[PDB]
Structure 1
């Protein structure tokens, strides 16, 4: 696996790929 530069919805896509089934939490600092 390679390092990632992921902004915006691209990071939700990478989380969804990484966690699959388990799901994930998307928690931006804000």
Structure 2
């Protein structure tokens, strides 16, 4: 994978990519 600071939906999109159908959890606003 590339090493870049992800933010906004970019970061999510990655999980949506890595996790694909596995299902991931993105929330708990830091």
Same fold (TM over 0.5): yes
Unaligned runs of 5+ in 1: none
Q: Higher strand share goes to which structure?
A: 1
Q: Which runs of 5+ in 2 are unaligned?
A: none
Deviation >6 Å, runs of 4+: none
TM-score using structure 1 length:
0.64
State how many pairs are aligned. Answer: 29
